[PDB]
Amino acid sequence: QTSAVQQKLAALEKSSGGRLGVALIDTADNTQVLYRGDERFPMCSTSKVMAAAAVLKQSETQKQLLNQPVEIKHADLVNYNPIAEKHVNGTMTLAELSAAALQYSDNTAMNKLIAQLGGPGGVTAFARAIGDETFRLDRTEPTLNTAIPGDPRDTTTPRAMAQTLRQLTLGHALGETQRAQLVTWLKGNTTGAASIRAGLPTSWTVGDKTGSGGYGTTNDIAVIWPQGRAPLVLVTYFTQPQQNAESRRDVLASAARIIAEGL
Numbered sequence: 001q002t003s004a005v006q007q008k009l010a011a012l013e014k015s016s017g018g019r020l021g022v023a024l025i026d027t028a029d030n031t032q033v034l035y036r037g038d039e040r041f042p043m044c045s046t047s048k049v050m051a052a053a054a055v056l057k058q059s060e061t062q063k064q065l066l067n068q069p070v071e072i073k074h075a076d077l078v079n080y081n082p083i084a085e086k087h088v089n090g091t092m093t094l095a096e097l098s099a100a101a102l103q104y105s106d107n108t109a110m111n112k113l114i115a116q117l118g119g120p121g122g123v124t125a126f127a128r129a130i131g132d133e134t135f136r137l138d139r140t141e142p143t144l145n146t147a148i149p150g151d152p153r154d155t156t157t158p159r160a161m162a163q164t165l166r167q168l169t170l171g172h173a174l175g176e177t178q179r180a181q182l183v184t185w186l187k188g189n190t191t192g193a194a195s196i197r198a199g200l201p202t203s204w205t206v207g208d209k210t211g212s213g214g215y216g217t218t219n220d221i222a223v224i225w226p227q228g229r230a231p232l233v234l235v236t237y238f239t240q241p242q243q244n245a246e247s248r249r250d251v252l253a254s255a256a257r258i259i260a261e262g263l
């Protein structure tokens with residue numbers, strides 16, 4: 001029934017003391033490998049990909065939207081604002097906000113993307129418009145990262161997020177220009193070195209977005225271009241039983257290493 005890959009992921013999960021969700025899509029043959037693939041997990045900052053993509057979608061009809069400056073005031077700042085703090089009483093364009101959200105995991109930037117879309121519901125509406133039936137964004141930053149056991153808010157499943165990331169970055173949920181821009185942003189992420197990237201060969205090109213939250217929630221979603229074969233998407237979601245659990249980016253690296261063997 002279970003494959004050796006799934007068995008190795010279950011053993012990793014058991015040793016870790018938490019709950020692990022994995023979804024791999026190999027676009028060479030569209031095969032999927034899943035571990036808890038249809039269970040809900042808290043997204044935390046991996047949800048920034050959907051918000052940035054939603055704004056890219058808007059820019060398909062509004063060509064200069066990405067260059068629209070948005071004001072940043074002292075009152076806009078939340079708990080982690082590495083880029084936005086440099087622009088208080090100034091502006092950031094929607095492209096600048098997208099890059100900050102994706103590449104530095106800036107939470108003020110995310111809240112400005114959410115506002116551009118009319119609220120968390122506008123991000124969910126985009127997900128539904130591209131065929132993601134599972135994603136839900138309910139809250140803004142920072143409260144979307146609470147990752148409370150059993151709370152459906154701000155969750156998705158590994159299978160759904162892998163399918164969506166494939167459609168956004170390798171498929172045609174976005175226009176060609178916009179797809180390329182998303183790939184550029186993800187490739188330049190600064191926060192991923194210890195997560196999926198650490199478990200994959202160095203020679204492979206990787207675009208990813210991490211997430212972290214309460215209950216030791218440690219997440220990563222990635223588009224991957226192995227050397228000499230078709231690209232892959234990999235999702236790794238991890239969360240723990242106790243509220244103040246530590247981060248476990250090493251678990252995500254180990255999950256990626258296990259998945260890479262069976263390719």
Ligand SMILES: OC[C@H]1O[C@@](CO)(O[C@H]2O[C@H](CO)[C@@H](O)[C@H](O)[C@H]2O)[C@@H](O)[C@@H]1O
Nearest residue numbers: 075076077078108111112114115140141
């Ligand atoms: O960046 C401000 C912008 O974000 C939104 C959510 O998209 O509000 C967030 O930030 C406010 C100011 O820091 C908070 O008052 C609010 O609770 C929080 O969700 C927008 O409403 C606002 O335009």
